[PDB]
Amino acid sequence: FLQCYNCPNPTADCKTAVQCSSDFDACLITKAGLQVYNKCWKFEHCNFNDVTTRLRENELTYYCCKKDLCNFNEQ
């Protein structure tokens, strides 16, 4: 399994460390203005189309990774 910070909704400091389901193979960090997304995620969805449509954010920056808790905001 992978561990990621995973919060259901964007928050300033998502500190909720989870062991993600077998469904997930990546951790996501996304910054769209000052809302921050941290999620258990899927590498197949690590692109602008899938991140933007799934978060409903237009302009954003994102980073996907596969080491435990690599999901931090300073990333």
Q: Name the method of structure determination.
A: X-ray
Q: Which CATH class is domain 1-75?
A: mainly beta
Break the chain into its structural domains and give their ranges.
1-75
Q: What angle do CA 71, 74, 75 make, to 5 degrees?
A: 55
How many C-beta atoms surround the C-beta of residue 63 within 10 A?
15
Distance CA 53, CA 9 (A): 15
Q: Give the burial class of 52: count Cβ atoms within 10 A of its Cβ; 0-12 exposed, 13-18 middle, 19 or more buried.
A: middle
Distance CA 68, CA 59 (A): 27
Q: From 56, 57, 62, 2, select the one nearest 29 (Cα to Cα).
A: 62
Declared resolution, Å: 2.1
Scanning the chain, the segments in alpha helix (DSSP H) are: 48-55
Phi and psi for 50 in degrees, rounded to 5?
Answer: -80, -35
Burial class, 23, CB count within 10 angstroms (exposed 0-12 / middle 13-18 / buried 19+):
exposed
